[PDB]
Amino acid sequence: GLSDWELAAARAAIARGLDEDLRYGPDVTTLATVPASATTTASLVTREAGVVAGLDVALLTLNEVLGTNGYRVLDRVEDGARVPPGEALMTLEAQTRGLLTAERTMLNLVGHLSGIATATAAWVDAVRGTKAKIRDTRKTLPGLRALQKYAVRTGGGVNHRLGLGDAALIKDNHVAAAGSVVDALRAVRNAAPDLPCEVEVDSLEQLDAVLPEKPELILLDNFAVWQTQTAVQRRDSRAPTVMLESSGGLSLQTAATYAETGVDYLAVGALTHSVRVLDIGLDM
Amino acid sequence: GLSDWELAAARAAIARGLDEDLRYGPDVTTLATVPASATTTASLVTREAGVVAGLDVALLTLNEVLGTNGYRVLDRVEDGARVPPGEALMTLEAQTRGLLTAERTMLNLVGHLSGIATATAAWVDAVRGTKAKIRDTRKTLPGLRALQKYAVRTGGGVNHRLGLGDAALIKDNHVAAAGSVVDALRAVRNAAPDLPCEVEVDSLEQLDAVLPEKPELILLDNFAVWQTQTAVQRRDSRAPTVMLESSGGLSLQTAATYAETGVDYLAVGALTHSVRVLDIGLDM
Ligand SMILES: O=C(O)c1cccnc1C(=O)O
Ligand SMILES: O=C(O)c1cccnc1C(=O)O
């Protein structure tokens, strides 16, 4: 479910969402059309198929708008559930005004997160029968990292680092600064020897240069499938304990091809940047 | 450029972005590889074509990380510029450590906002030769509405309402609550007779019923092209002053056909939910 940190990230997001909606005044239109005493049974229903994620975030939105004792959940599906088109994700009974005010914020969050989990489950199916795991990146939206990371996990992927001090990842700009891949690698080993280290290589030459150093992980940056295969062959013979992760020109159509080379992971930025919403509506 | 509200939204976003990155500890890898005294000229360069938006947000991230006197902008492109693949959006000279730490948050913001401006510009080209304007919706991400709304405007779109009290919009759930389309419309007229009112109809029957009431705008919910043409013909004959807006089963491939019917606007939720990042890198 949501973690302590994820829950707090969630409340903060629902709080910013509601404030964007209410900043210009109250919900004049629902105030004018529905009485305070109104109550309904409404359903979060999908207009399309996908994997559901972020259903608790819906409940948190209601808590914020209606208060915990302001609604009742008659039925609900579990996050991670693969779902067909007119499926009712959650049925609840609540004061109508509260629902109509919470609606857009609530729908926007779960449609976004379900979008993420739906995509990641696609990648996960793509590399099935391979040892490869799908991983995310730090290409997340400011303020939503904890929720986006949660959604990929829900769709079956595995999280990469959550931030900069979380783990080390020597990139092209460090190698440049350090003047060398090995230089950079050594430098970070000396500075934070307790920290996981990933080194990013963009060529087979660099790959040969760092394999002996035995870093935890090497990220193959934009390798062609034939280069990824060579990379795997070199690693298997020289440093069996080093893990390989592809990142770069990955597409869902090519994902199995790369996976088949034997790499350990596929790092997919699109899982978090470039997400397509799962279309969900609130039906009363 | 950015307004006071967009500026504050931007600062709030960059602040959330950086905290996500630094929450676990400092940037160990750049601290270990690049000296405090280091300085470079770096460029924000696109890996693909599109429309640029959010460059100011890049400068704001540096202000936050390097301080105003921590960097120098040698060159920059203007927001709204149509840009080719290897184009340099902005070239600057700054302390290297500051750049590497600001990088991901900076790239994530401008890449997102450029993806939005890029897409809205495609719709705008699509309905070119028509009087139709591309508008957005409230289907925005929590905490990013002001920026996303700014971006569609940059791409050539026009913003719809910013929140719930901004303007009235009678939706299906209000119609259900009010029992009738006409009931609902009347109710809001009585309650906020000064505020802008848009009424959403999902049938020509409903359309016929509200046309006489003369609302400011009528949102045609999921009308087929032929129904949109009829709607425009009836509006032109019965209530010339009523403005029509298509929202629903709109696709970039169908955009011009709908625009040609004569509607005044096309409300596109995809512009802000479902956005694909404009790929941009920081080259040193
Ligand atoms: O920083 C990361 O963890 C990361 C890991 C794999 C691929 N990309 C990234 C990135 O955001 O640049
Ligand atoms: O509420 C709005 O502003 C709105 C306006 C046009 C289309 N959709 C919406 C929506 O978010 O439901």
Coordinates of C-alpha atoms and ligand atoms in Angstrom, one line a residue:
Chain A
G1 CA 0.0 0.0 0.0
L2 CA 1.1 3.6 0.5
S3 CA 4.2 4.1 2.7
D4 CA 4.5 6.8 5.4
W5 CA 6.3 8.9 2.9
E6 CA 3.9 8.0 0.0
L7 CA 0.9 8.9 2.2
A8 CA 2.4 12.3 3.0
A9 CA 3.3 12.8 -0.6
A10 CA -0.3 12.0 -1.4
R11 CA -1.9 14.4 1.1
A12 CA 0.3 17.1 -0.1
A13 CA -0.6 16.5 -3.7
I14 CA -4.4 16.3 -2.9
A15 CA -3.9 19.5 -0.9
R16 CA -2.3 21.3 -3.8
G17 CA -4.9 20.0 -6.2
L18 CA -7.9 21.2 -4.1
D19 CA -6.2 24.5 -3.6
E20 CA -5.9 25.0 -7.3
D21 CA -9.7 24.3 -7.7
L22 CA -10.8 26.5 -4.8
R23 CA -8.4 29.4 -5.1
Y24 CA -10.8 31.6 -7.0
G25 CA -13.7 31.0 -4.7
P26 CA -16.1 28.2 -3.9
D27 CA -17.7 25.7 -6.2
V28 CA -20.4 28.1 -7.2
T29 CA -22.1 25.6 -9.6
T30 CA -22.5 22.7 -7.1
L31 CA -23.5 25.1 -4.4
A32 CA -26.3 26.5 -6.7
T33 CA -27.5 23.1 -7.9
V34 CA -27.2 20.6 -5.1
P35 CA -28.4 21.0 -1.4
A36 CA -26.1 20.5 1.5
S37 CA -28.3 17.5 2.6
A38 CA -27.9 15.6 -0.7
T39 CA -26.3 12.2 -0.8
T40 CA -25.6 9.7 -3.5
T41 CA -24.0 6.4 -4.4
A42 CA -21.4 7.2 -7.1
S43 CA -18.9 5.0 -9.0
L44 CA -15.4 5.4 -10.2
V45 CA -15.8 3.6 -13.5
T46 CA -13.2 3.0 -16.2
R47 CA -13.9 4.0 -19.7
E48 CA -11.1 1.8 -20.8
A49 CA -9.0 -1.3 -19.8
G50 CA -5.8 -1.1 -17.8
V51 CA -4.3 -1.7 -14.4
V52 CA -5.6 0.3 -11.5
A53 CA -3.4 2.2 -9.1
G54 CA -3.9 5.0 -6.6
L55 CA -7.3 4.1 -5.2
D56 CA -6.3 5.0 -1.7
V57 CA -5.5 8.4 -3.0
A58 CA -9.2 8.7 -3.9
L59 CA -10.2 7.9 -0.4
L60 CA -7.7 10.5 0.9
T61 CA -9.3 13.1 -1.3
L62 CA -12.7 12.4 0.3
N63 CA -11.2 12.5 3.8
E64 CA -9.9 15.9 2.9
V65 CA -13.1 17.2 1.5
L66 CA -15.8 15.2 3.4
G67 CA -14.0 14.0 6.5
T68 CA -13.5 10.3 7.3
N69 CA -17.1 10.0 8.5
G70 CA -18.3 11.8 5.4
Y71 CA -18.6 8.8 3.2
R72 CA -18.9 5.1 3.0
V73 CA -17.2 2.7 0.6
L74 CA -19.7 0.0 -0.5
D75 CA -17.3 -1.7 -2.7
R76 CA -13.8 -1.3 -4.2
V77 CA -11.2 -3.1 -6.3
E78 CA -7.6 -3.6 -5.2
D79 CA -4.8 -1.5 -6.6
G80 CA -2.9 -3.5 -9.2
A81 CA -6.0 -5.1 -10.6
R82 CA -6.2 -5.6 -14.3
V83 CA -9.5 -4.1 -15.4
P84 CA -11.8 -4.1 -18.4
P85 CA -13.7 -1.0 -19.7
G86 CA -16.9 -0.4 -17.8
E87 CA -15.5 -1.8 -14.5
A88 CA -16.5 -0.1 -11.2
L89 CA -13.3 0.5 -9.3
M90 CA -15.0 1.8 -6.3
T91 CA -18.6 2.4 -5.2
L92 CA -19.3 4.9 -2.4
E93 CA -22.1 6.8 -0.7
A94 CA -21.3 10.4 0.2
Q95 CA -22.7 13.8 0.5
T96 CA -23.2 14.9 -3.1
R97 CA -21.6 18.4 -2.9
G98 CA -18.4 17.0 -1.4
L99 CA -18.2 14.4 -4.2
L100 CA -18.6 17.0 -7.0
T101 CA -16.0 19.2 -5.5
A102 CA -13.5 16.4 -5.0
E103 CA -14.2 14.7 -8.3
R104 CA -11.7 16.4 -10.7
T105 CA -8.7 16.2 -8.2
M106 CA -9.5 12.6 -7.3
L107 CA -9.9 11.5 -11.0
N108 CA -6.8 13.4 -12.1
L109 CA -4.6 11.5 -9.6
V110 CA -5.9 8.0 -10.1
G111 CA -6.1 8.4 -13.8
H112 CA -2.5 9.5 -13.8
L113 CA -1.3 6.8 -11.6
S114 CA -3.3 4.1 -13.3
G115 CA -1.8 5.4 -16.5
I116 CA 1.7 4.7 -15.1
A117 CA 0.9 1.2 -13.8
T118 CA -0.9 0.3 -17.0
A119 CA 2.1 1.3 -19.1
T120 CA 4.6 -0.5 -16.8
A121 CA 2.6 -3.7 -16.8
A122 CA 2.8 -3.6 -20.6
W123 CA 6.6 -3.5 -20.4
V124 CA 6.5 -6.2 -17.8
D125 CA 4.5 -8.4 -20.1
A126 CA 6.8 -7.6 -23.0
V127 CA 9.9 -9.0 -21.3
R128 CA 8.2 -12.0 -19.9
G129 CA 10.3 -15.2 -20.1
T130 CA 13.4 -13.2 -19.7
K131 CA 15.3 -12.4 -16.5
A132 CA 15.0 -8.6 -17.1
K133 CA 13.2 -6.3 -14.7
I134 CA 11.7 -2.9 -15.7
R135 CA 12.9 0.0 -13.7
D136 CA 12.1 3.7 -13.5
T137 CA 14.2 6.8 -13.6
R138 CA 14.4 10.2 -11.9
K139 CA 12.5 11.7 -14.9
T140 CA 9.5 12.3 -12.7
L141 CA 7.2 15.3 -12.2
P142 CA 8.2 17.8 -9.4
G143 CA 6.1 16.9 -6.4
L144 CA 4.9 13.6 -7.7
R145 CA 7.9 11.3 -7.5
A146 CA 6.7 9.2 -4.6
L147 CA 3.3 8.7 -6.3
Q148 CA 4.8 7.9 -9.7
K149 CA 7.4 5.5 -8.2
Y150 CA 4.5 3.8 -6.4
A151 CA 2.5 3.4 -9.6
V152 CA 5.3 1.6 -11.4
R153 CA 5.8 -0.8 -8.5
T154 CA 2.0 -1.4 -8.7
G155 CA 2.3 -2.2 -12.4
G156 CA 5.1 -4.7 -11.6
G157 CA 8.3 -2.7 -12.1
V158 CA 11.0 -2.0 -9.6
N159 CA 12.1 1.3 -8.4
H160 CA 15.5 2.8 -9.1
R161 CA 17.0 5.4 -6.8
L162 CA 14.7 7.9 -5.3
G163 CA 17.1 10.8 -5.4
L164 CA 20.7 11.9 -5.8
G165 CA 22.1 10.7 -2.4
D166 CA 20.1 7.5 -2.5
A167 CA 22.7 5.7 -4.6
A168 CA 25.5 6.8 -6.9
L169 CA 25.2 7.0 -10.7
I170 CA 28.2 8.2 -12.6
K171 CA 26.8 9.9 -15.7
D172 CA 28.4 11.5 -18.7
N173 CA 28.8 14.9 -17.1
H174 CA 30.8 13.4 -14.2
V175 CA 33.0 11.2 -16.3
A176 CA 33.8 14.5 -18.2
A177 CA 34.5 16.4 -15.0
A178 CA 36.5 13.5 -13.5
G179 CA 38.2 13.1 -16.9
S180 CA 37.7 9.4 -17.0
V181 CA 35.2 6.6 -16.2
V182 CA 37.6 4.8 -14.0
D183 CA 38.7 8.0 -12.4
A184 CA 35.2 9.0 -11.5
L185 CA 34.4 5.4 -10.4
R186 CA 37.4 5.2 -8.1
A187 CA 36.7 8.7 -6.7
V188 CA 33.1 7.8 -5.7
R189 CA 34.3 4.5 -4.3
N190 CA 36.7 6.3 -2.0
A191 CA 34.1 9.0 -1.1
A192 CA 31.0 6.8 -0.4
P193 CA 32.2 3.1 -0.3
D194 CA 29.0 2.1 1.5
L195 CA 26.8 3.5 -1.2
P196 CA 25.5 1.5 -4.3
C197 CA 27.3 2.6 -7.4
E198 CA 26.1 2.5 -11.0
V199 CA 28.3 3.8 -13.8
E200 CA 27.0 4.9 -17.1
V201 CA 28.9 3.9 -20.3
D202 CA 28.1 5.0 -23.9
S203 CA 30.5 2.7 -25.7
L204 CA 32.0 -0.8 -25.7
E205 CA 35.4 0.7 -25.0
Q206 CA 34.3 2.4 -21.8
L207 CA 32.5 -0.8 -20.9
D208 CA 35.9 -2.8 -21.2
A209 CA 37.5 -0.1 -19.0
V210 CA 35.0 -0.3 -16.2
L211 CA 34.3 -4.1 -16.1
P212 CA 37.5 -4.8 -14.3
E213 CA 36.7 -2.3 -11.6
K214 CA 33.6 -4.4 -10.8
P215 CA 31.0 -1.7 -10.3
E216 CA 27.6 -2.8 -8.9
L217 CA 25.8 -1.8 -12.1
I218 CA 26.6 -0.5 -15.5
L219 CA 23.9 1.4 -17.5
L220 CA 24.3 0.9 -21.2
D221 CA 23.4 4.2 -22.6
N222 CA 21.8 4.0 -26.0
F223 CA 23.4 0.7 -27.2
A224 CA 22.1 -1.0 -30.3
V225 CA 20.8 -4.6 -29.7
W226 CA 24.0 -6.0 -31.2
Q227 CA 26.1 -3.9 -28.8
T228 CA 24.0 -4.9 -25.8
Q229 CA 24.5 -8.6 -26.8
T230 CA 28.3 -8.0 -26.9
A231 CA 28.1 -6.2 -23.6
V232 CA 26.4 -9.2 -22.0
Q233 CA 28.9 -11.5 -23.5
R234 CA 31.8 -9.5 -22.1
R235 CA 30.3 -9.2 -18.7
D236 CA 29.5 -12.9 -18.5
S237 CA 33.0 -13.9 -19.1
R238 CA 34.9 -11.2 -17.2
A239 CA 32.8 -10.0 -14.3
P240 CA 29.8 -12.2 -13.7
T241 CA 28.7 -10.2 -10.6
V242 CA 28.3 -6.9 -12.5
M243 CA 24.7 -6.1 -13.5
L244 CA 23.7 -4.6 -16.8
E245 CA 20.9 -2.1 -17.3
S246 CA 19.8 -0.7 -20.7
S247 CA 18.6 2.9 -20.9
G248 CA 18.1 4.9 -24.0
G249 CA 16.5 4.0 -27.2
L250 CA 14.0 1.6 -25.7
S251 CA 10.5 1.2 -27.1
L252 CA 7.8 -1.3 -26.2
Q253 CA 8.2 -2.8 -29.6
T254 CA 11.9 -3.4 -29.1
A255 CA 11.8 -4.2 -25.4
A256 CA 11.8 -8.0 -25.8
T257 CA 14.7 -7.9 -28.2
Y258 CA 16.8 -6.1 -25.7
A259 CA 15.6 -8.2 -22.9
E260 CA 16.5 -11.3 -24.8
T261 CA 20.2 -10.2 -25.0
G262 CA 20.2 -11.2 -21.3
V263 CA 20.5 -7.7 -19.6
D264 CA 19.4 -7.5 -16.0
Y265 CA 17.2 -4.4 -16.2
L266 CA 15.5 -2.1 -18.7
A267 CA 15.4 1.5 -17.3
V268 CA 12.4 3.2 -18.9
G269 CA 12.0 7.0 -18.5
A270 CA 8.7 7.1 -20.5
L271 CA 7.0 5.2 -17.6
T272 CA 7.0 8.5 -15.7
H273 CA 7.6 11.3 -18.3
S274 CA 5.2 10.9 -21.2
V275 CA 2.3 9.1 -19.4
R276 CA -1.2 8.6 -20.9
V277 CA -4.1 8.8 -18.5
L278 CA -6.3 5.8 -17.8
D279 CA -9.8 7.3 -18.6
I280 CA -11.9 7.1 -15.5
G281 CA -15.2 8.7 -14.7
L282 CA -17.3 9.3 -11.6
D283 CA -20.8 8.0 -12.4
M284 CA -23.8 9.0 -10.2
Chain B
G1 CA 7.3 35.8 -19.4
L2 CA 6.0 34.2 -16.3
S3 CA 3.5 36.1 -14.2
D4 CA 3.6 36.6 -10.5
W5 CA 1.3 33.6 -10.0
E6 CA 3.1 31.4 -12.5
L7 CA 6.4 32.5 -11.1
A8 CA 5.3 31.5 -7.6
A9 CA 3.9 28.2 -8.9
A10 CA 7.2 27.7 -10.7
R11 CA 9.3 28.3 -7.4
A12 CA 7.0 26.0 -5.5
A13 CA 7.5 23.3 -8.1
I14 CA 11.3 23.7 -8.3
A15 CA 11.3 23.6 -4.5
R16 CA 9.4 20.3 -4.5
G17 CA 11.6 18.9 -7.2
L18 CA 15.0 19.6 -5.5
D19 CA 13.7 18.3 -2.2
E20 CA 12.9 15.0 -3.9
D21 CA 16.4 14.9 -5.1
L22 CA 18.2 15.9 -1.9
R23 CA 15.9 14.3 0.6
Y24 CA 18.3 11.3 0.9
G25 CA 21.6 13.1 1.2
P26 CA 23.7 15.3 -1.0
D27 CA 24.7 14.7 -4.5
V28 CA 27.6 12.4 -3.5
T29 CA 28.7 11.6 -7.1
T30 CA 29.2 15.2 -8.2
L31 CA 30.8 16.2 -4.9
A32 CA 33.3 13.3 -5.4
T33 CA 34.0 14.1 -9.1
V34 CA 33.8 17.9 -9.6
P35 CA 35.6 20.5 -7.6
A36 CA 33.8 23.5 -6.0
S37 CA 35.9 25.8 -8.2
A38 CA 34.8 24.2 -11.5
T39 CA 32.9 26.2 -14.1
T40 CA 31.6 25.3 -17.5
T41 CA 29.5 26.5 -20.4
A42 CA 26.6 24.1 -20.9
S43 CA 23.8 24.1 -23.3
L44 CA 20.1 23.0 -23.0
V45 CA 19.8 21.2 -26.3
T46 CA 16.8 19.4 -27.8
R47 CA 17.1 15.8 -28.9
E48 CA 14.0 16.4 -31.0
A49 CA 11.9 19.0 -32.7
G50 CA 9.1 20.9 -31.0
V51 CA 8.0 24.2 -29.4
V52 CA 9.9 25.4 -26.4
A53 CA 8.2 26.5 -23.2
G54 CA 9.4 27.0 -19.6
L55 CA 12.9 28.3 -20.2
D56 CA 12.4 30.8 -17.4
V57 CA 11.7 27.9 -15.1
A58 CA 15.3 26.7 -15.9
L59 CA 16.7 30.1 -14.9
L60 CA 14.6 29.9 -11.6
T61 CA 16.1 26.5 -10.8
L62 CA 19.6 27.9 -11.1
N63 CA 18.7 31.0 -8.9
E64 CA 17.6 28.5 -6.3
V65 CA 20.7 26.3 -6.6
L66 CA 23.5 28.7 -7.7
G67 CA 22.2 32.1 -6.7
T68 CA 21.6 34.9 -9.1
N69 CA 25.3 35.7 -9.3
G70 CA 26.2 32.0 -9.7
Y71 CA 25.7 31.8 -13.5
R72 CA 25.7 33.7 -16.7
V73 CA 23.4 33.3 -19.6
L74 CA 25.4 33.7 -22.8
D75 CA 22.5 32.9 -25.0
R76 CA 18.8 31.8 -25.0
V77 CA 15.9 31.2 -27.3
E78 CA 12.5 32.7 -26.6
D79 CA 9.6 30.7 -25.2
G80 CA 7.3 29.7 -28.1
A81 CA 10.1 29.1 -30.6
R82 CA 9.7 26.2 -33.0
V83 CA 12.9 24.3 -32.7
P84 CA 14.8 21.6 -34.7
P85 CA 16.5 18.5 -33.2
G86 CA 20.0 19.6 -32.2
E87 CA 19.0 23.1 -31.3
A88 CA 20.6 24.9 -28.3
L89 CA 17.7 26.5 -26.3
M90 CA 20.0 28.2 -23.9
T91 CA 23.8 28.4 -23.4
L92 CA 25.1 29.4 -20.0
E93 CA 28.3 29.6 -18.0
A94 CA 28.0 28.4 -14.4
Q95 CA 29.6 26.5 -11.5
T96 CA 29.7 22.9 -12.6
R97 CA 28.5 21.4 -9.3
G98 CA 25.4 23.6 -9.2
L99 CA 24.5 22.6 -12.8
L100 CA 24.7 18.9 -12.2
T101 CA 22.6 19.1 -9.2
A102 CA 20.0 21.4 -10.8
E103 CA 19.9 19.4 -14.1
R104 CA 17.3 16.7 -13.6
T105 CA 14.7 19.0 -12.0
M106 CA 15.3 21.7 -14.6
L107 CA 15.1 19.2 -17.5
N108 CA 11.9 17.6 -16.1
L109 CA 10.1 20.9 -15.9
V110 CA 11.0 22.3 -19.3
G111 CA 10.7 19.0 -21.0
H112 CA 7.1 18.7 -19.6
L113 CA 6.0 22.2 -20.5
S114 CA 7.6 21.9 -23.9
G115 CA 5.8 18.6 -24.6
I116 CA 2.5 20.5 -23.8
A117 CA 3.3 23.6 -26.0
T118 CA 4.5 21.2 -28.8
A119 CA 1.2 19.3 -28.7
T120 CA -1.0 22.3 -28.5
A121 CA 0.8 23.8 -31.4
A122 CA -0.1 20.7 -33.5
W123 CA -3.8 21.1 -32.7
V124 CA -3.5 24.8 -33.5
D125 CA -2.0 23.9 -36.9
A126 CA -4.7 21.4 -37.4
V127 CA -7.6 23.8 -37.0
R128 CA -5.7 26.5 -39.0
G129 CA -8.1 28.1 -41.5
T130 CA -10.9 27.8 -39.1
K131 CA -12.0 30.3 -36.4
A132 CA -11.7 27.6 -33.7
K133 CA -9.4 28.1 -30.8
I134 CA -7.8 25.2 -28.8
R135 CA -8.7 25.4 -25.1
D136 CA -7.6 23.3 -22.2
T137 CA -9.5 21.7 -19.3
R138 CA -9.2 21.1 -15.6
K139 CA -7.6 17.8 -16.3
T140 CA -4.2 19.0 -15.0
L141 CA -1.8 17.4 -12.6
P142 CA -1.9 18.5 -8.9
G143 CA 0.5 21.3 -8.2
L144 CA 1.2 22.0 -11.9
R145 CA -2.0 23.7 -13.3
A146 CA -0.5 27.2 -13.5
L147 CA 2.5 25.9 -15.4
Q148 CA 0.5 23.6 -17.7
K149 CA -2.0 26.4 -18.4
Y150 CA 0.9 28.7 -19.2
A151 CA 2.4 26.1 -21.6
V152 CA -0.8 25.7 -23.7
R153 CA -1.0 29.4 -24.0
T154 CA 2.6 29.3 -25.2
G155 CA 1.8 26.7 -27.8
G156 CA -1.0 29.0 -29.2
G157 CA -3.9 27.8 -27.1
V158 CA -6.3 29.8 -24.9
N159 CA -7.0 28.9 -21.3
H160 CA -10.4 27.8 -20.1
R161 CA -11.2 28.3 -16.4
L162 CA -8.5 27.9 -13.8
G163 CA -10.7 26.5 -11.1
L164 CA -14.2 25.9 -9.8
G165 CA -15.2 29.5 -8.8
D166 CA -13.6 31.1 -11.8
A167 CA -16.6 30.4 -13.9
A168 CA -19.6 28.1 -13.8
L169 CA -19.8 24.9 -15.8
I170 CA -22.9 22.8 -15.4
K171 CA -21.8 19.2 -15.8
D172 CA -23.7 15.9 -16.0
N173 CA -23.5 15.2 -12.3
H174 CA -25.1 18.6 -11.5
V175 CA -27.8 17.9 -14.2
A176 CA -28.4 14.6 -12.3
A177 CA -28.5 16.4 -9.0
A178 CA -30.6 19.3 -10.3
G179 CA -32.8 16.8 -12.0
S180 CA -32.8 18.7 -15.3
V181 CA -30.5 20.6 -17.7
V182 CA -32.8 23.6 -17.6
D183 CA -33.3 23.3 -13.9
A184 CA -29.6 23.4 -13.3
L185 CA -29.0 26.3 -15.7
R186 CA -31.7 28.4 -14.0
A187 CA -30.4 27.5 -10.6
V188 CA -26.9 28.8 -11.4
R189 CA -28.4 32.0 -13.1
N190 CA -30.2 32.8 -9.8
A191 CA -27.2 32.0 -7.7
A192 CA -24.3 33.7 -9.6
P193 CA -26.0 35.9 -12.2
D194 CA -22.7 37.9 -12.6
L195 CA -20.4 34.9 -13.3
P196 CA -19.6 33.3 -16.7
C197 CA -21.7 30.2 -17.3
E198 CA -21.1 27.2 -19.6
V199 CA -23.6 24.4 -19.7
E200 CA -22.6 20.9 -20.8
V201 CA -25.0 19.0 -23.1
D202 CA -24.6 15.5 -24.3
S203 CA -27.5 15.4 -26.8
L204 CA -29.3 17.6 -29.4
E205 CA -32.4 17.2 -27.3
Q206 CA -30.7 18.8 -24.3
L207 CA -29.2 21.3 -26.7
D208 CA -32.6 22.3 -27.9
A209 CA -33.8 22.7 -24.4
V210 CA -31.0 25.0 -23.2
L211 CA -30.5 27.1 -26.4
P212 CA -33.6 29.3 -25.6
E213 CA -32.2 30.0 -22.1
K214 CA -29.3 31.6 -23.9
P215 CA -26.3 30.4 -21.9
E216 CA -22.8 31.9 -22.4
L217 CA -21.3 28.7 -23.8
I218 CA -22.6 25.2 -24.5
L219 CA -20.2 22.3 -24.3
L220 CA -21.0 19.7 -26.8
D221 CA -20.1 16.5 -25.0
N222 CA -19.0 13.8 -27.3
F223 CA -20.9 14.8 -30.4
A224 CA -20.3 13.2 -33.8
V225 CA -19.2 15.6 -36.5
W226 CA -22.6 15.5 -38.1
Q227 CA -24.2 16.3 -34.7
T228 CA -21.8 19.2 -34.3
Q229 CA -22.7 20.6 -37.6
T230 CA -26.4 20.4 -36.7
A231 CA -25.7 22.0 -33.4
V232 CA -24.0 24.9 -35.2
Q233 CA -26.9 25.3 -37.6
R234 CA -29.5 25.4 -34.8
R235 CA -27.3 27.8 -32.7
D236 CA -26.9 30.1 -35.8
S237 CA -30.6 30.2 -36.3
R238 CA -32.0 30.3 -32.7
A239 CA -29.3 31.9 -30.5
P240 CA -26.5 33.5 -32.5
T241 CA -24.9 34.8 -29.3
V242 CA -24.4 31.3 -27.7
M243 CA -20.9 30.0 -28.2
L244 CA -20.2 26.4 -28.8
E245 CA -17.3 24.3 -27.6
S246 CA -16.5 20.7 -28.6
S247 CA -15.2 18.4 -25.9
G248 CA -15.1 14.6 -26.0
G249 CA -14.1 12.2 -28.7
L250 CA -11.6 14.6 -30.2
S251 CA -8.4 13.3 -31.8
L252 CA -5.7 15.2 -33.7
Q253 CA -6.8 13.3 -36.8
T254 CA -10.4 14.5 -36.5
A255 CA -9.6 18.1 -35.3
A256 CA -10.0 19.9 -38.6
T257 CA -13.3 18.2 -39.4
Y258 CA -14.8 19.4 -36.2
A259 CA -13.4 22.8 -36.6
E260 CA -14.8 23.1 -40.0
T261 CA -18.4 22.6 -38.6
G262 CA -17.9 26.1 -37.3
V263 CA -17.6 25.6 -33.5
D264 CA -15.9 28.3 -31.6
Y265 CA -13.6 26.2 -29.5
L266 CA -12.2 22.7 -29.1
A267 CA -11.6 21.7 -25.4
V268 CA -8.7 19.3 -25.3
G269 CA -8.0 17.4 -22.1
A270 CA -5.0 15.5 -23.6
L271 CA -3.1 18.7 -23.8
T272 CA -2.5 18.4 -20.0
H273 CA -3.3 14.8 -19.0
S274 CA -1.4 12.4 -21.3
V275 CA 1.6 14.6 -22.2
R276 CA 4.7 13.3 -24.0
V277 CA 7.9 14.9 -22.9
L278 CA 10.0 17.0 -25.3
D279 CA 13.4 15.3 -25.0
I280 CA 16.0 17.8 -24.0
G281 CA 19.5 17.3 -22.6
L282 CA 22.1 19.4 -20.7
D283 CA 25.3 19.2 -22.7
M284 CA 28.6 20.1 -21.2
Ligands
LIG1 O1 19.0 8.9 -12.3 C1 18.6 7.7 -12.4 O2 18.4 6.9 -11.4 C2 18.4 7.1 -13.8 C3 18.5 5.7 -13.8 C4 18.3 5.1 -15.0 C5 18.0 5.9 -16.2 N1 17.9 7.2 -16.1 C6 18.0 7.8 -14.9 C7 17.9 9.3 -15.1 O3 16.9 9.9 -14.5 O4 18.7 10.1 -15.7
LIG2 O1 -14.1 21.8 -15.6 C1 -13.5 22.4 -16.6 O2 -12.9 23.5 -16.5 C2 -13.5 21.6 -18.0 C3 -13.7 22.4 -19.1 C4 -13.7 21.8 -20.4 C5 -13.6 20.5 -20.5 N1 -13.3 19.7 -19.4 C6 -13.3 20.2 -18.2 C7 -13.1 19.3 -17.1 O3 -11.9 19.3 -16.5 O4 -13.9 18.4 -16.7

